[PDB]
Write a protein that binds this ligand. Structure first.
Ligand SMILES: Nc1ncnc2c1ncn2[C@@H]1O[C@H](COP(=O)(O)OP(=O)(O)O)[C@@H](O)[C@H]1O
Lengths: 165, 369, 171
């Protein structure tokens, strides 16, 4: 209802998605999370050119990557070709991001620009793991990160109204 | 009982860890981390601003503690390993940092050569430090360094990088995808370090003589492998430059001042009694000392300069022998400072206390009062 | 093969069996007939190209008349394009691989993330490149063209098989 999403998106399995109100999705984000479930929350956001596919089958012979997960008031910039990333509350991805398979990116995280996380690359909380390969670049603040994520949810619900119908 | 953090600086790579720990826990370079910094400025710099070095040392030692030490700088001692002849302003800046921002219990600006001697356990030897900036010889006899006998040469790792930069810039055969020389006006130091360690090597004494004959009217060993480079800017190193790089390190140029000649010069200024004991105890520390064939060519150069008719009549037949430290030559001095830091008996009285520095400000150094 | 309705193809592309093209599989094989392989999985956001036109302008006797091909177990992932990659047996292309023009991809090809393929470079077998380290010939035998990297590719292909049946059933 409140999630005033765009109209030029792409996905399959209408019930497999999970996007609560006050969210803001963008166009061209071909998220084919049809087979496995796609989990998200309220006031979250994503951007264009981000084909966030789901993790895996979730029911293979041995182990298999589960459906999906996302957090509230999070943000995923442009060209975020993410895959299999359980996002916590107040997470913040960057432009041209690459989420590795089976990555439980904890709360208050901060991805970088063109960062290629490897498969099964766990990211700590309030620690901006970045670089080309996996590398704990620096330590991100707590208060400023929570305020920035709340401001992100605010700007996402205060800009999505125009040019999206 | 508390431990002792043994901090060792360096213009290229800093070494740090705890006391008693065989080998440091981490060897991080002297680079920094700052936004809008295309090239991280080195922390160990000389003849520059005071407050800038104060801030650089604060942030570098801070990130050093909080990233490779995992301990608050108040519960354990600090033994700052600094080589001798270090500039007084640099030492005063280190002391200001450690006593005004971190407030450690006691610092100890201990020399490098002395603890390098402590690693072997013996009390007397000749120590050749092939550091990054310059080479340094400091004879130690009965635990006391013969400070008037010294020697320095700007033929450390920096001279090797300067040599590799100029020579590879000349024969810059970067293939397309054929020569393409001087594509970039300057190349960085990381690729140059990788060329030093992974591709360059120390030649032989006879091979060095062949290079000397090749200087003016042949380079006998030709092995080479095309060193890659990102962005498909694949270059091709030469089979002779991998020899010439060490040849300039062991060059004399009618001044009789090579890396190996510095030990003989300091041995000449040493007293008559100390001569044979320093000849029977030779220690080679430093980072440049980890090159393949460096010690063999070094000892061969020493013995080749023994019968030289300028140093023979005062030295003559001697028994030169190099010791083998129980740690890597690039990190020997740190292990000596580690064994010294693991000695909590007199270090509480040997090191400079915090109270004395706060109420005095004077730092002990070999200067009057 | 899973000829998905969302899989946007273009031109005469005489595909092969088991070439499951996923949704939003934008491609182009008109100026060069790209034949698909047997045992791959064309994922989302891909970009198959054929005969780089006159925008780049090949002013070197343009008389190409050559079609692209594919191989077995060479599943290309999302983000990565396909600029006429003459692949072979089990040459997987991971996320965001900038596919190059003349790269004869042999077996055991693990196209790492953000690895711009080298134009006019004969991609030999058994070589996996590093991510930040471009052209890293690391794992010369670990990433072996047969029984090691191809075995790992056939092992990753099992999830692709279950996904092939699942996508054929979900559609
Ligand atoms: N494994 C190695 N093999 C060969 N050379 C090395 C190796 N590690 C470091 N070096 C050389 O050692 C130098 C570092 O010396 P360093 O101990 O930093 O000098 P300083 O005494 O000023 O700290 C570098 O210039 C590098 O060329």
């Amino acid at each position: 209802s409140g999630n005033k999403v765009s109209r030029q998106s792409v996905l399959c399995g209408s019930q497999n998605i999970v996007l609560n109100g006050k969210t803001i999705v963008m166009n061209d984000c071909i998220i084919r999370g049809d087979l496995a479930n796609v989990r998200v929350g309220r006031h979250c956001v994503v951007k264009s050119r981000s084909v966030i596919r789901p993790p895996f089958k979730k029911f293979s012979k041995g182990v298999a990557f589960f459906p999906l997960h996302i957090g509230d008031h999070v943000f995923i910039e442009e060209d975020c070709v993410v895959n299999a990333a359980q996002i916590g509350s107040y997470v913040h991805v960057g432009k041209n991001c690459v989420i590795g398979r089976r990555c439980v990116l904890k709360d208050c995280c901060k991805i970088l620009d063109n960062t290629v996380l490897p498969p099964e690359t766990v990211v700590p909380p309030f620690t901006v793991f970045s670089g080309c390969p996996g590398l704990f670049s620096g330590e991100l603040p707590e208060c400023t990160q929570e305020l920035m994520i709340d401001v992100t949810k605010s700007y996402y619900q205060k800009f999505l109204p125009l040019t999206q119908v | 009982e508390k431990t002792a953090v043994v901090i060792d600086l360096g213009e290229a790579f800093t070494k740090c860890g705890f006391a008693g720990e065989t080998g440091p826990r981490c060897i991080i370079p002297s680079v920094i981390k700052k936004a809008g910094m295309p090239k991280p400025i080195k922390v160990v710099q000389y003849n520059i601003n005071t407050e800038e070095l104060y801030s650089y040392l604060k942030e570098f030692i801070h990130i050093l503690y909080f990233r490779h030490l995992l301990v608050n700088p108040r519960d354990r001692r600090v033994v700052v390993i600094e080589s001798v002849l270090c500039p007084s302003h640099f030492r005063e800046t280190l002391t200001r940092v450690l006593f005004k921002y971190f407030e450690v219990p006691s610092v100890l600006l201990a020399p490098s050569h002395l603890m390098a001697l402590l690693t072997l356990g013996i009390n007397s030897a000749m120590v050749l430090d092939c550091g990054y900036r310059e080479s340094l010889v400091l004879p130690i006899y009965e635990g006391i360094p013969v400070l008037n006998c010294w020697g320095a040469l700007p033929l450390g790792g920096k001279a090797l990088h300067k040599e590799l930069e100029t020579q590879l810039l000349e024969q810059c055969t970067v293939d397309t995808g054929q020569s393409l020389p001087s594509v970039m006006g300057s190349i960085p130091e990381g690729v140059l370090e990788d060329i030093k360690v992974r591709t360059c090597f120390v030649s032989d004494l006879t091979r060095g003589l062949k290079i000397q004959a090749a200087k003016f009217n042949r380079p006998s060993p030709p092995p080479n492998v095309d060193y890659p480079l990102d962005g498909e800017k694949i270059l091709h190193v030469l089979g002779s430059i991998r020899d010439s790089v060490v040849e300039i390190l062991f060059e004399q140029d009618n001044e009789e001042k090579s890396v190996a000649t510095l030990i003989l010069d300091s041995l000449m200024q040493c007293p008559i009694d100390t001569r044979k004991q320093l000849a029977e105890n030779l220690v080679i520390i430093g980072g440049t000392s980890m090159l393949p064939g460096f010690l063999h060519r070094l000892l061969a150069e020493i013995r080749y300069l023994v019968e030289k008719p300028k140093y023979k009549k005062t030295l003559g037949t001697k028994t030169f022998r190099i010791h083998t430290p129980p740690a890597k030559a690039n990190c020997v001095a740190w292990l000596g400072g580690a064994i010294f830091g693991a000695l909590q008996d007199i270090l509480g009285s040997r090191s400079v206390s915090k109270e004395y520095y706060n109420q005095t400000g004077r730092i002990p150094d070999w200067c009057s009062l | 093969a899973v000829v998905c309705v969302e899989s946007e193809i273009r031109g005469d592309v005489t595909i092969g069996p088991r070439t499951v093209i996923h949704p939003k599989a934008r491609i182009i094989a008109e100026a060069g007939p790209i034949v698909i392989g047997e045992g791959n999985l064309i994922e989302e956001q891909a970009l198959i190209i054929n005969a780089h036109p006159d925008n780049i302008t090949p002013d070197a006797e343009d008389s190409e008349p050559k079609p692209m091909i594919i191989g077995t177990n060479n599943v290309f992932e999302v983000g990565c394009y396909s600029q006429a990659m003459k692949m072979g047996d089990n040459n997987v292309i991971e996320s965001k691989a900038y596919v190059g023009r003349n790269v004869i991809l042999t077996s055991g090809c693990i196209i790492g993330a953000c690895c711009n393929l080298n134009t006019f470079e004969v991609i030999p077998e058994n070589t996996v490149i590093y991510g930040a380290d471009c052209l890293r010939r690391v794992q010369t035998e670990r990433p072996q063209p047969q029984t090691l990297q191809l075995d790992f590719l056939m092992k990753i292909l099992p999830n692709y098989h279950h996904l092939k049946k699942t996508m054929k059933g979900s559609s």
